[PDB]
Ligand binder design. Sequence first.
Ligand code: HEM
Ligand code: HEM
Lengths: 362, 363
Amino acid sequence: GSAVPFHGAHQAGIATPVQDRLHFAAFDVTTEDRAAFVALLKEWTAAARRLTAGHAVGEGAYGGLPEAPPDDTGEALGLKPSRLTLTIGFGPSLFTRFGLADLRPEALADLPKFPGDNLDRARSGGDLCVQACADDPQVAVHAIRNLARIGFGKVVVRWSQLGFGKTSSTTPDKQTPRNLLGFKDGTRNIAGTEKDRLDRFVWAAEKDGTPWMTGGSYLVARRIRMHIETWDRASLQEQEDVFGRDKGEGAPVGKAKERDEPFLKAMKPDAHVRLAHPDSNGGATLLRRGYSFTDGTDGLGRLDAGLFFLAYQRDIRTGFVPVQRNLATDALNEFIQHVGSAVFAVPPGVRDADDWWGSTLF
Amino acid sequence: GSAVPFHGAHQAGIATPVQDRLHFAAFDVTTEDRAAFVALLKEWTAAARRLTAGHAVGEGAYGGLPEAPPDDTGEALGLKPSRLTLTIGFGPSLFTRFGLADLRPEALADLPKFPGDNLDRARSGGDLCVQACADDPQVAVHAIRNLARIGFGKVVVRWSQLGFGKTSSTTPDKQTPRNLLGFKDGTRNIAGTEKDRLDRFVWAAEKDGTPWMTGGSYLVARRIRMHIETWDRASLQEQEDVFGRDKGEGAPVGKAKERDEPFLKAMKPDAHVRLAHPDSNGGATLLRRGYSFTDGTDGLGRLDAGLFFLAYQRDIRTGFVPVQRNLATDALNEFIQHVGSAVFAVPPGVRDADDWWGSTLFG
Ligand code: HEM
Ligand code: HEM
């Protein structure tokens, strides 16, 4: 129920312990006025400071002038902060506006087409994103709703994704959650305590070539549909062979415990863990921070199910791209399809009460 | 606060404490073979007994024969029972199968068309429902996914809805949840503690005319979209006037406290509370047990959110129908739209370890 501090050198919501719920929204910008957009970023920052401390935005949810709409929509009244974090990112398309073209980071790379991609263009891309994570879904929806309202006339929601449960871990001392295939997901991640590993693999450094991004990170989002009918008829051995870990304990094949180190040569050559492991990818390491989703039925008699995969990294070209390229032969590909994609530059943290989202860029 | 008993005279999930999360699924039946369907109901009951105790279905999620698919899909391993309840219901369309046409309860009435209805046929109806409620949404989803799998070849999933209420880890049990319009929702309801009110208004009695339904109830489900962005532009006064209660405290107009009894004549004539109150409907009283939903954003960038309204009652004709008819002129209608609907007969409880869902109907 506690608050996660909002200010810092880095934005919260990355290294932070992974909260139970996600509401992710991508926005397109509809104003060509730079000053108007800067004013929005400041108003959003002010709102975020309220929201993440469990307070209502603006002058509150009630007790104002009867003839005015309340400043806050009110559905989070009486609720705790619930570890709400709000993380903003800027998409490549933003940099075509406001004279920003030459400030687009090299590390904000467009992704290549990957074999098997079936990307919905309507649920891909976006000028900007807001990741809202919290332990209470109502708290997360309230935050996104109120930001969108404040931004009316300057930004529109392009697409959104709710995540009902986490499929990631930045806290190895706590139980690793399972994805909808029934496997633990998050054992070998980067922990929030691993400052050296965060600095090496997650945070952008001044020397990487884009000074305004120092202390930021780069985000890849992939909406992945799971073929659960196909998976559910697979044998136990087939499932375990796909991953290279057993299902019950989630230990590497041959070993007894979840957190025993993988011995890659005992896994099938097309096992997911074997192909995704840093040692298979020249050391490339990601911070995975995704969530599960179900968006109803598929119209063919079955539940829809998927994973909204989020990865943070210091450079898209040295993080997600090499690892995904190496997944071209993954046994897991029989059971999944990527159907949405976006990339974002996640700026540095809001340093104090006078700072604002995007201040280093603008 | 860990598990809710599965067995009882009544199915759990109606009068038992309201859990934080919902996964509601409607199923259509694909078999014409009564014996095959009965067999399914027995297998589903066996699975439900395991699921509600926090155990995997069948022989488990791992450790069986390597060359066999696991009996349980495994995504709830490591989780707690989470107060899971599984409540089954039978839709009117089920009664056109298996020779059951003369056993359809008269209280399982088809709803009339109501003004402003915009029902999506794909997210309406269904031969069967399973209401899965739990504090952890993964526990609920796991239940529905595994029931659907056990039933594959005999049933299909027609439509599915996830919902949320409060989060109990951080929110006191007594506090009334707010809906997504920002108003407290549930103040004047039937509580599961009110045994006599449940007998009067919720449970079917034998003398009501359908003996197999004694101890059961009737469910109306309505997927109600809110026009969030239009609502959020309304003034505070307009919003309070729509309901007849203030937004901060949720007190009736002219009163000080949430739980103060309303004075209906102080409210506007078409205020929601005034139109919905039992006194305005000949005493008709409902058990509301709905959940909020937020599914995403639509193609216009608007929030696809609302209330997945669930009401339990002793007879649809004397519960939901009169009350919803009375909402024809509700000021709230400007801001909502009913976009899905279904009705179900919820049979009596599973009495003991040898009983099974639907045993009073199938025999
Ligand atoms: C639906 C899609 C996916 C599923 C179900 C899945 C599942 C898993 C599982 C069960 C593990 C083992 C436990 C762990 O260490 O986390 C794992 C590990 C991993 N996955 Fe995935 N994954 C998916 C997609 C991806 C994608 C798209 C990437 C990257 C492009 C990826 C990268 C990784 C990495 C880096 C590891 C850790 C390998 C190691 O260092 O041991 N996964 N995944
Ligand atoms: C999105 C749709 C709806 C919203 C936002 C809504 C909201 C509310 C709110 C805020 C209250 C007052 C507090 C309370 O006592 O719970 C209320 C009361 C009530 N509502 Fe609704 N409602 C909706 C739909 C319906 C429908 C479809 C029905 C029935 C057909 C209904 C029946 C009732 C009843 C019976 C009461 C209690 C009245 C009393 O006895 O004081 N509501 N609703």
